[PDB]
Write a protein that binds this ligand. Structure first.
Ligand code: HEM
Ligand code: HEM
Ligand code: HEM
Ligand code: HEM
Ligand SMILES: O[C@@H]1COCC[C@H]1[C@H]1c2ccccc2-c2cncn21
Ligand SMILES: O[C@@H]1COCC[C@H]1[C@H]1c2ccccc2-c2cncn21
Ligand SMILES: O[C@@H]1COCC[C@H]1[C@H]1c2ccccc2-c2cncn21
Ligand SMILES: O[C@@H]1COCC[C@H]1[C@H]1c2ccccc2-c2cncn21
Lengths: 343, 343, 344, 345
């Protein structure tokens, strides 16, 4: 073929219709606003392309096969790389002044950011749960989409999410077997014994101002480290939304996290890293978007009532962090010797 | 002289003393931790060097002289550039694993993060207020310091801060004069007349859901826009800490913000931009530091039974933003034609 | 009005046709290759949109009017910001392996990067010159285009380029007037007297190997500074292509460069800076692209009998630098006191 | 200990002596110039710390042991990360104007950028050879040093470089054994038969314009792919300096490069990638340092009538790229099916 025809530039480079130009008063900066979003949507399409291919590798149940595992890790890293660029893409819109923006703002109404199907699909496919999704202007997230788009968005809710699939894989981690290696058993013993060593040692220190603080630190460290073995706490925190992964998935995640230097757990750890990197960048994107909406509209300007800036500020939270459990693995790090070994 | 002697490399490259190596068990990654902090401290010294030079240009009262104004804007931009790099410097410490970090963590005690004199001076010299700051372990920030350091740290609180100096400059903005150009007067009249025209436009509009939805938004925006002309409200918000700049400073800031395209207001706006950039990057530094402490240490782990991650997450707030008023200027943007004519 | 309809997502998100998928054997990484180029082309469209608006502000002859000058500087800075991002966009294609790329490479032929109309227009509108443009496999860039495209590409060559327009503006700089301020005169005298004083200073020093180093450097710098006032040398370098701006434009550029701290020359300098940034980033884009063609195809693999990597290596040079004269202004920097004082 | 004492800030933050201030006329921007270099030198110290630890892991001969292999790959990646930041650090010095720079430039003489011991050690320890070093003002790089420094710089030349150590490791790659798996044998046969099959499809009537260029390209590709198996050519290119790795090392590198998707060759490939990244970033550092030396003092000025810019422009070349052979692995890229099948050997 020919470059332009292969890339369908007859469609791509003929999709720029300025509403200010259509309504007479053509505003120059409107073209930047069009291109920016079109670039974002092209990248969301690519993110979904990678995400759906990764999801299907899991659905086949052959993720553990080293060749398929690499495809997952690499494509997950790619999404991380795309998102990294997408955060930097805000710097283009920083060149647009608040004044020049408002010259065309009026022509954009009533079109909303909530009408970005690709962003919504991307959120749903990762594992952003609808139940613990903050509602704007007493209106639900799916009311903006009314048609074949609503049908496609329902599929993303129903179908197995990336979190659901990663949970499944984490549950099947070798070494968790109580009759086999028994990681959870061995760990509980070394930790309880490690803390007994620690409590007596913080007591075998001179009665200073530092001790009333260290004793109180112990009651919270001991609480955190042992609550790991309390399954009822885990089941209560899951219902609240404070935890996403199942108890067995959490055990698998901790195993990979501790044995990250081991050859068998290097690549599974890389995947966990990529899942955390995707979540951090999804947050940085939301944060950089919040700043953009504050610079252009203000902390009070919204849609027929409540400010848009205050709804979006509540989306830049740990509730929107799908792989929140993976971030909390670091709260349970124990000295190297306390980790059960091998022969 | 000679490269090494000029750069005093006999001091710089002979300041790396590994505590794990001193206490026998040498940990390799400890050297990375030393170098990173030494690089940060060199950059904080440079930030303070620029900041103090900018502060003294203001103190002389000749900041309005175009030649001195350029020195300020350029040096303020430089601080923005240094901070941009310091945020990126976290990526170096991302190469250190949580496991390898804990191997030397023990040797670091009792040295703390808020024992960094340069960072504290940097906060104080910008205008981070002592009353408007969150305490860790019910202790003050100055209690960790003693002697000559505590003496130097009190000077930064007492002496005129960058905010105090910018406020002073903003108060002396030409055009605010009520018998001169009378910007504030002209503005208030234009906003009243503007809202009136906007109202009869919404009133004559065909009675719908969007007609009543627009009335609710009009009433909220009308309230907001005229709240700007209530000086006692401003005075009450200043005491609460919700605002930092004086009422006359806020008027000057709004003048530069609206007339940013004017030749007389391009450079003063660049300064306001750089000040906002500094505040944004100071936040991004705090945020990137809190992501580092959440994956190196725990969400509950800290010093003396305290927050740790939770305290450093309360610093990543608008209360630590010194130039908060400058960010809120956007919440008062009015259509281009409502802005009073300059000539 | 709806988001998708406003942004014409029915066109944009329905323009992804994988050739490997069309020919059966669907290659996954091909979709990344499509999206990447489509993103690049959307950004080239935006760069051209800004560039053409800047060019028309100049063509009206009212660029010296501070309000129009700001529009130019700001939009030129925006192009710099867009280019900065496109350089970083190569990092996306770094995730694609050489192996996975060759699985679909076959399905792309005979389509070439030389068929990117927008990139060619972008080069021509800035002021990349055809006569001093390296030819690939004994074939000119315009041979790869036909019809309406070839007609539109001819217009970009004929019409006033950004360089031609900036040159025009630089020629009309106040202070160059020999009967007025006479900058070039004052500068020539001052550089002569300055070098004389600097010579007394080096000569009165103690005879050592440090003195002979300062001598050889003074002699070299004396040659460079005095060669600036040689207009025929400039005229000869212009014909060779080693310089692009006219002698009077070069004088205006030096004036802005020295008086950059002055209120009247702050914004004109910002423009000069922006142009240099655009040239630097256009080079960094070419460099980051030649580093991808090497990694994906190799040092010797080309289209015809010629090497792809070797040709693209010849574009990452100073001949493709439109604003090359602006980069060389630093070679003529003189001590602050040698600079002629300003008239109030 | 206390933060300041642990980090020896009494040394670090008391090492800033402005020469313009010492000679009366204090220039503000001089402090930026001091801090920038001090930051660079701290990072060069850290790069050397990682580099020397990586070099000793190789010298022990236990680099193939998966646990030690990871230490190497990770620390090599860290150097890549530090260098990435060092390239971005030039943006700090971009805030300094050419005019403000020249106000203090005079006070810096006769100190030179060549007097950076750490940078020289870093170059020598990687594998930048003295035989292929471009000379400035007809003065060798070692002449700018004296005493203990000159003694320490000689050690870096003598001792096994990172290239020498990587070459050694590449030579011992499993599968190269002619009686074992015999990769080079299998590969040679497959490339010959592969080229034959392509020639039969090309030479199959349709004498057009496109067909002749396709013959010209086949003939050029056939030449390059076959010249790979000519060990005589390789040893001639090694003596010229156009290649750095030994013929057996090149074979090992190609094996990892083709079998990169294999579980046994994932981590060795990551190392090769990190080595190439280090080489790319070392170049980007030199290039960004060339742009800066052009913006300040121009393109003609330097030392003793010799151009500073022009010399640093000649260091941006492929001659300074130590792992140049690794970059050229992409030139001998063959269709997936031509690559020999992996059997347990
Ligand atoms: C001029 C800059 C921008 C402004 C002022 C802006 C404003 C807003 C506002 C006010 C909202 C809340 C919903 C609404 O009324 O639309 C929103 C939502 C959103 N915006 Fe933007 N936006 C901007 C740029 C972007 C860009 C460049 C993208 C990328 C495609 C984007 C994607 C979205 C998405 C996906 C949402 C829904 C977010 C969520 O529910 O979590 N916006 N935007
Ligand atoms: C391994 C990575 C790091 C960890 C785990 C870490 C941990 C902490 C912790 C827990 C705190 C709270 C106070 C304390 O107990 O010390 C803190 C404070 C602080 N850290 Fe670090 N830190 C790290 C890296 C850095 C770096 C690279 C710098 C730069 C010099 C830095 C500068 C500071 C400063 C200035 C504070 C006081 C912050 C405030 O009060 O707002 N930290 N750090
Ligand atoms: C897989 C990565 C890429 C490879 C291997 C590649 C390869 C090449 C090659 C070999 C050429 C020489 C002409 C030809 O045969 O096409 C070329 C030219 C070109 N490529 Fe690419 N390219 C890549 C990515 C890109 C991207 C992402 C863009 C951005 C749109 C791009 C834009 C161009 C342009 C505009 C030219 C003409 C350059 C000139 O004449 O100065 N290429 N590319
Ligand atoms: C104001 C910016 C700078 C200028 C004008 C500058 C100029 C130069 C010049 C002219 C040379 C050639 C030798 C000489 O006469 O010194 C050189 C060499 C060098 N510079 Fe700089 N330099 C600058 C910044 C830096 C920085 C920030 C570093 C980092 C430490 C650096 C490191 C070096 C090194 C290591 C060399 C030797 C390079 C080689 O032989 O390959 N320079 N510099
Ligand atoms: O409703 C939004 C108000 O601010 C301006 C953009 C408005 C809206 C919008 C309309 C058309 C095309 C894109 C976008 C967009 C992205 N994020 C929010 N949106
Ligand atoms: O208190 C911190 C707990 O985590 C480990 C580092 C601890 C502390 C620390 C000890 C020694 C030298 C520097 C620093 C530093 C900077 N920011 C935090 N720190
Ligand atoms: O001719 C190029 C050889 O390498 C593969 C891509 C080939 C060509 C190509 C074909 C189709 C779509 C885009 C591109 C592109 C960008 N820069 C070069 N190209
Ligand atoms: O030789 C260089 C000419 O330009 C000014 C700096 C000169 C020289 C220099 C003097 C003192 C301290 C550091 C450096 C350095 C690093 N790279 C170049 N330099």
């Amino acid at each position: 073929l020919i470059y332009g025809n292969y890339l369908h530039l007859e469609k791509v480079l003929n999709a720029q219709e300025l509403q200010s130009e259509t309504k007479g008063n053509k505003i120059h900066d409107e073209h930047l606003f069009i291109i920016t979003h079109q670039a974002y949507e092209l990248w969301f399409k690519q993110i979904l392309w990678e995400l759906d291919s990764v999801r299907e590798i899991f659905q086949n149940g052959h993720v553990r096969d080293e060749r398929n595992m690499l495809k997952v890790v690499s494509r997950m890293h790619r999404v991380s790389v795309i998102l990294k660029l997408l955060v930097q893409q805000f710097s283009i819109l920083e060149t647009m002044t608040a004044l020049d923006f408002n010259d065309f703002r009026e022509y954009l109404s009533p079109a909303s950011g909530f009408q970005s199907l690709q962003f919504r699909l991307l959120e749903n496919k990762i594992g952003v749960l609808q139940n613990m999704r903050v509602p704007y202007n007493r209106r639900h997230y799916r009311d903006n989409f009314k048609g074949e788009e609503n049908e496609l968005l329902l599929k993303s809710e129903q179908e197995k999410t990336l979190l659901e699939l990663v949970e499944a894989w984490l549950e099947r981690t070798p070494g968790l077997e109580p009759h086999g290696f028994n990681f959870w058993g061995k760990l509980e013993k070394n930790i309880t014994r490690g803390l007994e060593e620690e409590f007596i040692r913080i007591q075998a220190k001179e009665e200073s101002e530092e001790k009333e603080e260290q004793v109180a630190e112990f009651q919270k460290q001991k609480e955190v480290l042992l609550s790991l073995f309390d399954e009822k706490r885990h089941e209560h925190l899951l219902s609240k939304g404070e935890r996403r992964l199942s108890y067995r998935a959490l055990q698998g995640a901790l195993m990979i996290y501790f044995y990250r230097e081991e050859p068998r757990f290097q690549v599974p750890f890389q995947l966990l890293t990529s899942l955390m990197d995707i979540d951090s960048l999804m947050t940085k994107w939301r944060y950089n978007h919040v700043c953009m909406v504050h610079r252009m509209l203000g902390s009070k300007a919204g849609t027929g009532g409540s400010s848009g800036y205050h709804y979006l500020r509540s989306t830049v939270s740990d509730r929107y962090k799908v792989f929140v459990d993976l971030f909390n693995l670091s709260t349970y790090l124990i000295p190297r010797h306390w980790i059960p070994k091998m022969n």
